[PDB]
């Protein structure tokens, strides 16, 4: 599923991401924009053999099981395919664990390089929230 900008913001808010760990909703929408272009089915293979999955490009070395990332963990206790569903519940619940891990949203490279320090509120402007 390719979410609309305001449609994703509303779904993230209902699932409790707005202000989670102090990160306003615009940070999460911006992160999803540059990680996946709002596409829940996005996948990208990394040089280490791991793969990033879903709207927030969650990595199989630490967070989910894809059966092909040797020596990896599954800290969200989910198959990586669960991060590709049109229902973003699994991605949100796993992102909550990631953002609590110590480095905050710096775990998302696209967020650090393209959202952090910018006017992230623009990503929810015009949305009925
Ligand atoms: O906080 C957790 O341990 C957790 C995570 Br991580 C995920 Br992913 C899911 C899910 O949507 O599958 C659920 Br339910 C829970 Br509880």
Resolution, Å (one decimal): 1.3
* Rounded Cα distance, 124 and 129, in Å: 8
**Neighbour count for residue 66 (Cβ, 10 Å):** 18
The method of structure determination was X-ray
Extract long-range pairs of 108-117: CB within 8 Å, 24+ residues apart.
108/31, 108/35, 108/56, 108/57, 110/31, 110/34, 110/35, 110/57, 111/27, 111/30, 111/31, 111/34, 111/35, 113/34, 114/30, 114/34, 115/27, 115/30, 115/31, 115/34
Beta strands at 51-53 and 43-45: parallel, antiparallel or unpaired: antiparallel
> Ligand 1 centre from 61 Cα, in Å?
17
Instruction: Give the CA distances from residue 38 to residues 11, 67, 93, in Å, rounded to whole numbers and listed in that order.
Output: 12, 25, 17
* Rounded Cα distance, 121 and 30, in Å: 9
Catalytic residue among 35, 66, 87, 119: 35
Measuring from atom 5 of ligand 1, which residue has the nearest CA? 93
**Neighbour count for residue 5 (Cβ, 10 Å):** 17
Please list the alpha-helical segments (H only) found in the chain: 5-14, 25-36, 89-99, 109-114
Task: Parse the chain into domains and list their residue ranges.
Answer: 5-124
* Rounded Cα distance, 80 and 103, in Å: 22
The domain made up of 5-124 is a member of CATH 3.40.50.720: no
């Amino acid at each position: 599923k390719v979410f609309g900008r305001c449609e994703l913001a509303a779904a993230m808010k209902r699932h409790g991401l707005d202000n989670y760990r102090g990160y306003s909703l615009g940070n999460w929408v911006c992160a999803a924009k540059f990680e996946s272009n709002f596409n829940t089915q996005a996948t990208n293979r990394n040089t280490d053999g791991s793969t990033d999955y879903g709207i927030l490009q969650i990595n199989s070395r630490w967070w989910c099981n894809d059966g092909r990332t040797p020596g990896s963990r599954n800290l969200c206790n989910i198959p990586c395919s669960a991060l590709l569903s049109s229902d973003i519940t699994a991605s949100v619940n796993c992102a909550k664990k990631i953002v609590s891990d110590g480095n905050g949203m710096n775990a998302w490279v696209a967020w650090r390089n393209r959202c952090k320090g910018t006017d992230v509120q623009a990503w929810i402007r015009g949305c009925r929230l």
